[PDB]
Write a protein that binds this ligand. Structure first.
Ligand SMILES: CO[C@@H]1C[C@](O)(C(=O)O)O[C@H]([C@H](O)CO)[C@@H]1O
Lengths: 218, 214
């Protein structure tokens, strides 16, 4: 049996309601027991999954009323009301009608006000500069929404080679995202150039936020 | 209080074998079906199989993706469940969970362990280099470059600094992970107070402190 969830993610504001959908490739309704063998699980980032709902609409003990499971046959849904920061997670449906199968998950995000990133640039450490390589790091911290563009410029020219980017999960404390961008060169190539710029373009402003440094000045 | 604790995970060569264990407590073990479920990092849960309860004669079932290759068994005396994995490939890389499953009535996995991380690669275990990143509000960081396999744990002041921290997911390149962590603090507390990131990389017995010097 194949389980499919939609949408794959969505964003809801605090105190509002979310509905997410789970579809089965064949009916999960057990005619003998008169129950749909479909369960809902919550998985917060880096944590173990937790049971919310079973038999389609029965909330596990200790799960609050604000979670509601519904549906029948092949068509199910989980609704969360008064969505709070604690709800940041991926939600999985799971059939147990014939063996068990999980859906691909729906990621719940908390929608908040748009927020400009705090951008910080770091030159290679002197200790790394005693090594063979050189990493230039730029942090773009506590912004909303999640998508952002970073461009590196070395001596005034864009450099895309050896740039690696990484995003945090939405922040629990303020619902923002952060990203790191790391530009790694050989030490020799690092020392053949002077001007290093990190440029963040975010939907908050038309103008990128720019941090730079000149190797000569450190 | 029910508890389930997975163990046996680690770095294993492609083509290898690995036995995982799940030690359970807090419940009448033989009353319950028990499942294994896995999750590749940043991806979905996948049910692998179950072993049935006393009533059903402890028989087993498996998902198509692992039927024939993985074997589940239980030791009732120990309240323990096992997964024997054979011919491990890269896509078997995942956190492996055990879960308490059905009892003959309750259609559910109420309890799940914390997971055990399995990495299937021929890439070599390598400790990280740890580099400080030094410059109202001020942001510092640590760059944790060139390690394998996952995970590392980064803290700030052995855990005493916990707000204003962003530890970014590692990225893999040419068989080495790199990640950075940042911490934002009041200017009126650095560099007047010391700041040290601590990086642990268990897989290589690595514990590093690196002071952020201005
Ligand atoms: C809730 O788990 C049940 C386990 C079992 O009883 C079985 O032992 O395979 O199968 C049930 C199916 O609906 C088939 O009856 C359910 O999947």
């Amino acid at each position: 049996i194949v389980m499919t969830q939609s949408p794959s993610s969505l964003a809801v504001s605090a105190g509002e309601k979310v509905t997410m959908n789970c579809k089965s490739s064949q009916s999960l309704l057990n005619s003998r027991t008169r129950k749909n063998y479909l369960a809902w699980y919550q998985q917060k980032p880096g944590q173990s999954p937790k049971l919310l709902i079973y038999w389609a609409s029965t909330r596990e003990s200790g799960v609050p009323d604000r979670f509601t499971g519904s549906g029948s046959g092949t068509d199910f849904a989980l609704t969360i009301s008064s969505v709070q920061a604690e709800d940041l997670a991926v939600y999985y449906c799971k059939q147990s009608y014939n063996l068990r199968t999980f859906g691909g998950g729906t990621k719940l995000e908390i929608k908040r006000a748009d927020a400009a990133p705090t951008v910080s640039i770091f030159p290679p450490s002197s200790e790394q500069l005693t090594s063979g390589g050189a990493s230039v790091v730029c942090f773009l911290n506590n912004f909303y929404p999640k998508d952002i563009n970073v461009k590196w410029k070395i001596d005034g020219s864009e450099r895309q080679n050896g740039v690696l980017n990484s995003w945090t999960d939405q922040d629990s404390k303020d619902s923002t995202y952060s990203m790191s961008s790391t530009l790694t060169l050989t030490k020799d190539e690092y020392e053949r150039h002077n001007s290093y710029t990190c440029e963040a373009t975010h939907k908050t402003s038309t103008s990128p936020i720019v941090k730079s440094f000149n190797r000569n000045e450190c | 209080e029910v508890k389930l604790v997975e163990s046996g995970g680690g770095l294993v060569q492609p083509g290898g074998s690995l036995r995982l264990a799940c030690a359970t407590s807090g419940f009448t073990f033989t009353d319950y079906y028990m499942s294994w479920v896995r999750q590749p990092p940043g991806k979905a849960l996948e049910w692998l199989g179950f072993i049935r309860n006393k009533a059903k004669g402890y028989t087993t079932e498996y998902s198509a993706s692992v039927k024939g290759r993985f074997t589940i068994s239980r030791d009732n005396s120990q309240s323990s469940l096992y997964l024997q994995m054979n011919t491990l490939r890269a896509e078997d890389s995942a956190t492996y969970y055990c879960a308490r499953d059905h009892d003959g009535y309750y259609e559910r996995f109420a309890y799940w362990g914390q997971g055990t991380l399995v990495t299937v690669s021929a890439a070599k275990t390598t400790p990280p280099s740890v580099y400080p990143l030094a410059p109202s509000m001020v942001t510092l960081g640590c760059l944790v470059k060139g390690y394998f396999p996952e995970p590392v744990t980064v803290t700030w002041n052995s855990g005493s600094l916990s707000s204003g921290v962003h530890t970014f997911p590692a990225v893999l390149q040419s068989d080495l992970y790199t990640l950075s962590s940042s911490v934002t603090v009041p200017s009126s507390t650095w560099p007047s107070e010391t700041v040290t990131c601590n990086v642990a990389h268990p897989a290589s017995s690595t514990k590093v402190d690196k002071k952020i010097v201005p």
